[PDB]
Symmetry: C3
Subunit: 232 residues, 3 copies
């Protein structure tokens, strides 16, 4: 539901966090708060791993366009900061995080997707930073998230050319780690999550931070520089 | 012709710049001036995108070997600086740049190729930094251009081992973005160019600079350090 | 033999260095000294290229676990420093280095493997940094070695998730450069070595250092920071 856009379900060693706002899982304030609250729940349950899913229509269509373009600056800035804060939180999360990309992932939807330790999508799901196509420059925080995962040549095209990836081209590019049929995307993500929960948690938490140190520092800077993007 | 080695042709939303010196499109002073002048023309026409092609024999065989090895130092330095200046100009160009790799691309030919936003080649076209094979160390400016596009492992082999890439291995390595049959390489490049011209120009110009900032800074330094390569 | 775990054989333009301790080629002090001594021999013979092989069972199972977990700190530190010193030496070696991955390569075995200019393995050979699986954080020196070769997304999974790679997935990830049938892994490595020996040696030595400068600096730092890993 739009009022209640996130569900949380503990399954033995994992927690499944599912976005469904009835529409395209826009990452506005309500959605961000719902996600953060679900993660707090996973912290409380001390689960072995997280799965985050979209709905049957998309993973996420990104930030809420209504807020972004209402003509009020501070709320748009605040929505942007919160989205990238959440990305930071997922990239630094001390448990394995698996993304079940259950539909298209556009812009912030794709940036959020790129925060998972393991990412599962179906062959025909579009993954795209479409900013340049719609006349926006890609924020530094988003650039750093993408640069952490996309091959050097895919990064060039994904950014400057707003290239759309899917299936095998998304896998080769580093926009996803696993392809599965639509009807088993979630099951495959849960399966992967259960396996990762068997890894040593301390070693995983510590190693992932080392493998992402420079990106996380650059993302923190990008979050604090969001206002400057606007020139504000 | 060798005297007139570059043609410029505006086609609606794109400009097609074609190298043909009657030979292997050596990137000597005349060729560099011809290319720069054609780009100035594209600036004047305010086109949506550029396509740059080679001839039916090669994309380019790289710098003019006659000048490089004549035994006169300053002209060789000046040719090298101009080639990498042109590369800098293409990597920072505010319109999408599509390379039609119409034949082999060796050394500076491959470095020039790697300056396109989108690069199209045929299956059997060799793309290779052959410096190490012929007893030269790869200039820092060239290393940075390659590092911007080649995967980490392909970069290692392309440089130290002068590895030759083509077709699928060039695509996987990040030496090209698209493979096409020889007879449609140019058509595919033009088609891609027309599509990219539909992107928001300001957003594209700004985003590509962000996606290349560190490389461009390192390339500027490499251009100013060309003389030092010789130990001069 | 365990007492005599390394053989050295000059073949025309190449030297073949073969690990076989009768077991899993554990990289303890004896093995490290044997390897260094074999390399000194290659220096003396001034060969064109090196091939390093494992045995019929593995490339290497990594550091000696007996020493690592005996409960004596300084010998474990010293073994670790020596392994990464040897890696530094191979990455900076002035002749082409080809690894014949003749069996599985785990942890330091995989890090050692990643020091070759060209790496050949068979389809079913597991290559894995398994540290996180067994509750250890990956040392910075090892992280830098891996980051030099693994694609951005493969690096994430190889480290934080202790992902196992093999065959095509290892090739795509950048854990190897060539796949061959088990019975010709060594022959293919020797063949590649002979070809690389035909490259200009000075240009190769100089170019590989440039292509690895930042990694080598970070690896030197990681070697000098091994004691700190323990918190010692
Ligand atoms: C400045 C830096 C910021 C950062 O970089 C990102 C920016 O946001 S730039 C990136 C900017 N993002 C984009 O330019 C495009 C993002 N969206 C899309 O690409 C497609 O809509 C999507 C593939 C998600 C769904 O395709 P589909 O399945 O064919 O469905 P559909 O297309 O017919 O739309 C369905 C309904 O949902 C609505 N709606 C859609 N998106 C949003 C949104 N972000 N928010 C709110 N609503 C959104 C839409 O209005 C419609 O509502 P209604 O009243 O019921 O008709
Ligand atoms: C120091 C840092 C600098 C930077 O890093 C790069 C350096 O330059 S290092 C890289 C150095 N580059 C190389 O080591 C090799 C570059 N060239 C090649 O790899 C091949 O020639 C190529 C594939 C291009 C064409 O193959 P193909 O189709 O079989 O044709 P072909 O092979 O039979 O030669 C055709 C004709 O063109 C001539 N010619 C060729 N290249 C050049 C040149 N760069 N210039 C002038 N001329 C050149 C050749 O002399 C011949 O002339 P002629 O009097 O009519 O006989
Ligand atoms: C802190 C930072 C350090 C750095 O990051 C790396 C660390 O070391 S973390 C990484 C830590 N490494 C690991 O967690 C695992 C590494 N080893 C393996 O993954 C597998 O053993 C391997 C695939 C190599 C062989 O499989 P297989 O063919 O089925 O054979 P097998 O499995 O049945 O064992 C055969 C025999 O060799 C023995 N032995 C094995 N490894 C070692 C060793 N490293 N040393 C000494 N011995 C070793 C084993 O005890 C056995 O002896 P025995 O008395 O005759 O029974």
């Amino acid at each position: 539901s739009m009022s209640d856009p996130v569900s949380y379900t503990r399954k033995d060693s994992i927690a499944v966090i599912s976005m469904d706002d009835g529409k395209v899982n826009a990452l506005g304030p309500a959605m961000q708060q719902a996600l953060n609250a679900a993660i707090d729940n996973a912290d409380r349950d001390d689960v072995g791993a997280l799965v985050i899913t979209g709905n049957g229509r998309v993973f996420s269509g990104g930030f809420d366009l209504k807020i972004l373009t209402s003509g009020e600056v501070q709320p748009a800035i605040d929505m942007l900061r919160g989205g990238f804060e959440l990305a930071y939180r997922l990239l630094s999360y001390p448990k394995p995080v698996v993304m079940a990309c259950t539909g298209h992932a556009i812009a912030m939807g794709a940036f959020l997707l790129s925060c998972g330790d393991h990412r599962v999508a179906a062959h025909a799901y579009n993954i795209q930073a479409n900013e340049v196509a719609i006349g926006m420059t890609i924020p530094y925080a988003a650039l750093e998230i993408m640069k952490l995962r996309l091959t050097r040549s895919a990064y060039q095209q994904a950014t400057g050319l707003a290239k759309t990836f899917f299936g095998e081209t998304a896998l080769a590019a580093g926009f996803i780690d696993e392809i599965a049929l639509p009807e088993v995307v979630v099951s495959r993500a849960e399966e992967a999550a259960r396996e990762f929960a068997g890894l040593n948690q301390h070693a995983h938490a510590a190693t992932k931070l080392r493998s992402r140190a420079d990106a996380l520092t650059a993302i923190r800077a990008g979050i604090d520089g969001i206002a400057a993007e606007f020139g504000l």
